[model samples]
Target chain A: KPLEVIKIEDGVYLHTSFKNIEGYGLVDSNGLVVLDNNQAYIIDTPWSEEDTKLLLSWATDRGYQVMASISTHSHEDRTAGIKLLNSKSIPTYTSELTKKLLAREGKPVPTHYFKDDEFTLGNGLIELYYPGAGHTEDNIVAWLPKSKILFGGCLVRSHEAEGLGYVGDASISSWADSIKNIVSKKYPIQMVVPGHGKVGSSDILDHTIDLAESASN
Target chain B: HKPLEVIKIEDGVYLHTSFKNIEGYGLVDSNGLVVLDNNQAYIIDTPWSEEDTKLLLSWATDRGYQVMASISTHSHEDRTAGIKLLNSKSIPTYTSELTKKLLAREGKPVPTHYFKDDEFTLGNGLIELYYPGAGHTEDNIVAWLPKSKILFGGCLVRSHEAEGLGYVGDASISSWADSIKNIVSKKYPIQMVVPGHGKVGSSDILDHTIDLAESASN
Candidate 1:
């Protein structure tokens, strides 16, 4: 029950891992597995290194070679498994900004850094877009154009989310605008997979925007 | 469900229209093209919804034509929403490598095959796909039927009914005019031009788009 994999589409899978936060109790975090030509690109890691290892085993069992992995932000939920991925010699990528933030906190840093606003992996099938600050200043969203799925990371709130779950490091005032940037791009998203909670449609973007706006006001 | 409106542009060329109500945009109609060669049909772009995409497939089937493949003009929904349906049926789908990258980044439905270069010829030159430059979207492309002299401009070219550049959120305003100019420089004996939306026309549609792009840039 610690790590569960759900197939959201033919070549895309959602990997949800659980963790017991001190105040938040048992929480779930989401990541993505985008497959192409028998190779897989991982977006974000599980909440724990142990869980990440399990996820990799699952991928190998299915004949999918885990080519690389990327973290969306510097938070523990996003970067906790980086060390494991790096140890396995799996290339780990993150924004240079996220790397700096992780360094500031003396946490595990990714092996590779992209300085641009957008980074493409999986031969351009997976795109990591930094739509500005939100849940965390370094947070970014992964888009799968072929599947029309947005792995919003922690920046996007699930439909069931009552409020922005943890906003200690969030840029509350600018969160709405960040979500708006994603909307403005007009991704034609069919499914929106949040960093936590249930998967939803593009309406969740509007829902997140509303939550951020109300919090800002 | 919205009905699919098919207009015969030439003997084997057709324009299929579909509608969707978008917030702030009212009801929007998107156009896709179908090119017939013997018993095979090649689709450029897709209707706005899956149902309409199915209807288009069925239309081709009813006419006893096999859908050889489909190519999306850009990464927008109107251009690519039907890609999943086409993929499910094992029909080969084509898009620019740039479009494929954009779609992968946006987490949208991606096409099956990708044309690596700026230009690609399909079915022994039955149709040609060209990437002029960034305009409507970074990955926007146009399909050309050299035989019919019909250019499927997709969303990159503006229709006569359009008053302005419809959506600039993902558009490259500064480069839009130059993209249109590239199309003009091709000097293809284009008799008819089809926009991603609205009525079809001659080369005037290309000039009108350039004007719109220039105005928007200013």
Candidate 2:
């Protein structure tokens, strides 16, 4: 499948595709590529190894240096293509928790493990925070303070998400608070990117909370 | 049989009851708490069914007690099945944000509010909600009432009769023991402990659950 892309802002883009999930049926998974100073950091990956290669080629061919790849959670939709990324010699980063999850699934672990307290991308330009447990115990979100853009990953939902999807490994107890922590009163987020579905404004966070309040398992 | 049973556990505290038959057999009765403060009360965990929840609310209403809110400790149906009943009465609900997410995925009704701190208060006492890590489910949280020295350990701590990890499909086997240790170290002087299922007892329940989880880890 071709990597469908949407420019979120001046340098941030959302790339997505439909993929079959183990138990949740076919779902549209999302990945993002953020460009900075002629370099790019991939927030997540497309579902397949082949598609990920296409994404990497597109970024590299466009004269953007693909510095590293990162995943917000440990699910396949987010990390399945890490091997391909590694094959291309691209260093990957994720929380140690995600690394442990990948190891459990017999998947390749990331080259770098983001410290639970703080992490960064491209010479400290972007910040990553693990605001406790949410969609998964290892879930984390990235913040681009300059752009006021937040990469919520699976921790935050898309506007069209009828319910929180694929919570087979979720921490229902702290997910909302984790998002609340991510949606700091201090940061002014102008745009948000989720793990799947359409990208939107800060309203995505509110929509996720609304989904949490309205549905149950 | 009564859909809900209320047993006064202490001054201004009562245990409300409902039952569950795992996979339509091996039945067990589950318990939640009603912590009373003046005329207002806060419910810990929801009853297992809307009918049982109605019985509990009606019981409280007849006693001139107003339920201020309801809380879910985890995403399991035994913990959240009755949340809809609480919503019907317009009583606000609260839980750890993680439990809210866990419930949403399970197609369960979620509470309206999320607990931000380790502890919440009512009147002059303190109610602490602690997430030591994952046990039972990734989202399970235990509530500690410091004033009464009573701890609502939810599914994280096993009841006396639980010979093994009761329901472990969602448990964090590697972290369950440490999670219990975190709870014990943080909330000392716990005179009573309530597991999500079965009877309530002394702090030995925590010790028992720790032992059970460690055995499973082997």
Candidate 3:
């Protein structure tokens, strides 16, 4: 698949792509782009560098400057385009730990890293936070408090998920606590953007926690 | 109580000082270390609050040390409470993977990063985070800076003034002595030691910790 851009709200777009894998057959991966005036901040990317370029071109064609990009975790689906982003001087950011894991995997690394913290978009319109470990040790979520929207990457499962998508690096034991930490902060989150599947309301957060709780057992 | 005492321990190294006025257990001040190199710093630990951490961060920024990351030796609030502040500044906080798991389980703000290996480095310092069995908790680890010969035994080792092990409910009685011995086994020509609760000194603190653990075990 090329790339599909869905506008969830004003200045918020979810870019999704479909790809086939050996064991998993075909699956869709989602990335987010939050716009601020002429600039935009990207969360994750399409499954391949080519697809990511398409998504970036989509923004540029719309007269938006790709101010910064961040990979939610070290997984290939999120990090595959980091090298391309860095090559284009987009200055991709991930956790130092995520950088370490990518180095171990011999993948292209992000240009910047935070241990766990928030990155502000222009005028503080959006913020990114590493709540805790869930889908991966370095997965982080982006929050738009002004809009009450949260781009919870692979750490949160889609409402349609039968089970957690991938468990190789998922923190089944502490995943529930991780989500609760986010929901308890009372961000007034009205809508959520999961890394895959369809976007929904706050119930997705509680539902993922239940999935994690059940997975842990 | 608000801004911590920042003490110069050595070149490119500082101690952020604070007190744990334990309501029922009496008062004891603690020390947190920061080591700098080439404009970058690796924090050994942090003060007990976000406000305190903000002060520490400002101090580091004012002094020209880009606080790159942090390492918490254990899951205690004293060691980790300021991690949120560090995170807020986009600085990565690190600990042993076990410490991360423990903090997450304990409902504390977990560190941003974690390592499974016993040793890692930051800047020019050779830091060995040793997991000597379990003394304080199953995840207790210490950072040994071989470059400076300073061992940061967070909660796992005792200060020379320690009358007894501060708290032992989470201690492993059978392995307490063994854990202390594991630290000594390295025999790294120890010149300085920083304990979790009080006082930074020489190998005497390590011996004092062994004596205290041995006595408690007996």
Candidate 4:
């Protein structure tokens, strides 16, 4: 499927898209559609602009309003659909660092920027944590306290991955420590969704640490 | 096409060669070591690609040898690429703490365990990992099989085909000669010396590497 959506729990949905990335074959990227009441919050963007539009239509068809959207990082996989969302008047949010990076790349910069390491939406039902740098210098993760799910973008590796997929923009040395930050937060994270792979349990965090630590000396 | 080739270098030691095509380097092959001890296997370094690593693992499994642990000689992808596959299979992976630190910093896949000292022994002394100072990388190390008198001189040692020191961007050119001298001083009964990339040879490989390092440093 070009775009797939699955309900993870009540009021939380997982969105995925397959985009052909050079040197990495047809890559599957994931994002989240979280609902609190009738308002929906987007975590990251679909890999393609069309997929993003489809995601919006899917939500609107269900009578849910996309109140705001956030891109976990500045990479194309996370920001490709930001322009589409902005054109529809949906407020897009990102870290100042992500904003600066998107601006530098001449990509569609988020409409709003968050200065704090942690951001909350939906009456604190969802939280965004900048757990240091892993996959990219601007990578961030979203936490759904109600569902105890962590939307770990590219910073977290899927169980199927034998290696870190790409590290061209990663903080290799600090990646493991960044994962540690998420674990140390002591959140009751039951399910973790990665940016590019299948959904997994909290063990995915430990698994990512293993991959990052293994890459070291 | 098969990208991995396994050659038995001794009664219980095998050399695994993996090929990769780089933009400037063309098709290049890298070497790793597999030492078998009492139905258990230990791997030194890994193939340059994951597919090649899977083949190497299958080769061992087909022979009913359970891989016990793996160690990367350094942090470069050529020496450490197979680490993720090995880890997935629940094989214990290792490197010097220094190498671990380097991999951690570069955000690469790191081994499970790390040794603090310059020398470490595995499989009850069947395999020995030694850091003979820095050459190819600051954390580069070499593996020795005392029983077979074979030294797996990963990337730090030059092959006969190496016209000059290859890819010295991360190399300790000045200290490379001294590192090779330390290996020679160890005075192990050197039977076969395997370079990280070319044909296996004798101690002359060490001398050739030293000459290259000295000239490059000059």
* Top lDDT hit: 1
DockQ, all models: 0.01, 0.01, 0.01, 0.02
TM-scores, in order shown? 0.50, 0.49, 0.49, 0.51
- Which 10-residue window in model 4 chain A sums to the lowest lDDT? A19-28
Where is model 2 more than 4 Å wrong at Cα?
Answer: A1-217, B22-26, B117-125
Q: Give per-residue CA lDDT, model 2, range A1-217, as digits (tens).
A: 3677788778888888664321112456777888887899898888778788888888978998898998887776667678888877888999888899899989888988865567877876678888878777988888987788888887888887766766667677677777787766467888888877777899898888776656533
When superposed on Cα atoms, how far off is each prediction in RMSD? 18.4, 20.5, 19.1, 19.5
lDDT (0-100) at residue A146 of candidate 4?
Answer: 90
In Å, residue B10's CA in model 3 sits off its true spot by 1.7
Task: Supply fnat for every model shown.
Answer: 0.00, 0.00, 0.00, 0.00
lDDT of 3 by residue, A1-217 (tens): 5689988878888898876321112467788888887788888888788999998999999999998888878876777789889889888888788889999999998888876566665568867787888887777888897778888988887788767766667788989989988876788889888887888899999899988899898
Error of 3 at B156 (Å): 1.0
Q: What lDDT tens digits, residue by residue, belong to model 3 across residues B90-179?
A: 899998888899888878788778887766665445466778888866778888877777888878877776677766656786688888
Backbone atom clashes (below 3 Å) for every candidate:
16, 21, 1, 17
lDDT value, residue B168 of candidate 3: 66
Whole-model lDDT, model 2: 0.78
Worst 10 residues of 3 chain A by lDDT: A19-28
For B1-218, candidate 4 gives per-residue lDDT tens digits of: 23799999899999999875321012456888899988999888888888888998999999999999988998888888888888888889899999999989989878889899999998889988899998887888998899999999988888887777776667789999999999999998898999888789998999999998899888
